[PDB]
Amino acid sequence: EWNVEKFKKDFEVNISSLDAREANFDLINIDTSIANAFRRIMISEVPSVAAEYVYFFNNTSVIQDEVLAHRIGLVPLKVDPDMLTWVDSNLPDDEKFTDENTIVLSLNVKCTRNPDAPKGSTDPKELYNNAHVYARDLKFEPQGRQSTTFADCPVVPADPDILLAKLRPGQEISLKAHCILGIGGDHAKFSPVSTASYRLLPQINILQPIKGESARRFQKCFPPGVIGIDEGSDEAYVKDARKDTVSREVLRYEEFADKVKLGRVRNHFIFNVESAGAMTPEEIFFKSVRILKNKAEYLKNCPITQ
Amino acid sequence: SSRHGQKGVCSRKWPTIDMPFSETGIQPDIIINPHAFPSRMTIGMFVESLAGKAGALHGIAQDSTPWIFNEDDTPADYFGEQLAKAGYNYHGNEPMYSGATGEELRADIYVGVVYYQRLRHMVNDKFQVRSTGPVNSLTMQPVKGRKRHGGIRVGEMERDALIGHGTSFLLQ
Amino acid sequence: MIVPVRCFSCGKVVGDKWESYLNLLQEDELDEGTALSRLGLKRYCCRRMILTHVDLIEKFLRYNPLEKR
């Protein structure tokens, strides 16, 4: 009968592809509630570090202060979120921000004209100086401890090329952003993943065999490599059902819609987790499962109140 | 509102985790109830969904000129074939999973790319409440207008309705 | 206003991919589809983000009142 050890016997993982920014891995023999739990947590509850309080001192640009502040919030920072604890709210602003809970990023850009390009618009970058304000212009400003702690992990935007604002001569932007630790559920800027999604393994149950040119003609109805034919005189086989996209295009043809069934494997889950750069996607998954476990420990430890 | 005069208020800002996610790994921007279409017959919106989806995947704009198409050259066939060449359901559906539970929904869900427009009438902001305020000197009754912190009118018909209910102590 | 930082639907940062995308449509004489394929916008939520963008800020910026004209 069911035990957690019979699950451990039955649970499988297969990792297809592990990139430092994307992980495509499978969870075989699990419950949908658990895969969805990991997905949901990877999205909303896994903490990440993002700009939260932007303090402007001047903004003469044609871009609205609020809007630019939101855009600076959206910039993902390449920061290991474990270098910082949460900032409370029960306490005054003077205690809220310390070098243990806050990261300071300064932005001071002044747009000028350049001494005379060639023709005219010869773009913007040659006619003007610092015409393009990028996330790469967010200078990291450490304090004390974290100054040393980041000696070998300085704060950088995970994509410096993000255009943040465009200026014109005499326009200027001076602001100081306070980046804090937050979760993707409280606001989408704190979600560390771009897309964490699962898809059930497509299953293509061939009810009766097809062969010859009808077998290859069936083969071309699916993504190139899902259905394989080795000889076709005896069978039209499935090279890999994982390549399919469930376009259900085969059902358009009576040649097949009565000799094939299209289902899924309820136990087999194909996870795809792509990271925004703040953290490696597998490490994000590790934090998600350790988060669910930590939540179960919190519920064990709590006293049932009445 | 869509470009189809099918306007609706946002009932809630659904969490992304709770939205439905496709096997493509996305969760929609907007969810519109299907039962709105059967009375309105806004099928141009269905075609705009399947055309914006085809045109985003192949990465080109689609021509929507009235009568560029024909009963013998339907848009469902044109964008159906273009989309199916792209790698998507010929009918334009996509297999979606429940955000909340996680099972695959009964059927392939109709997803697409639609030009949506924000009406200036955020009547949400037009809310007003008055439990106290100025009164006109000629009546001592609540003044008029939201910006005057005025009070909504209990008109003649609402009086009639309160007499209907027998609620004479509510009418007083 | 300006190329969005992220794709509303998915979440992938896209604001870095505008200028190269525009360069890829000019310099490489590419087509919008192939340019977006080389940019990694392999989802239509991302595809549409950059494909449909209208960088109206260039029109706004010529109204800069802080320099003589």
């Binding site: 592809s17 190139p224 996209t245 | 493509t24 995947l57 192949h58 560029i68 198409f69 024909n70 | -």
Partner: peptide
Amino acid sequence: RKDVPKVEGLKLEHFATGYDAEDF
């Protein structure tokens, strides 16, 4: 009447998650 022409670059733009045109 002429039928509106289908696009010439009508080719696969969608793959499974895990895959690419290296299998195309």
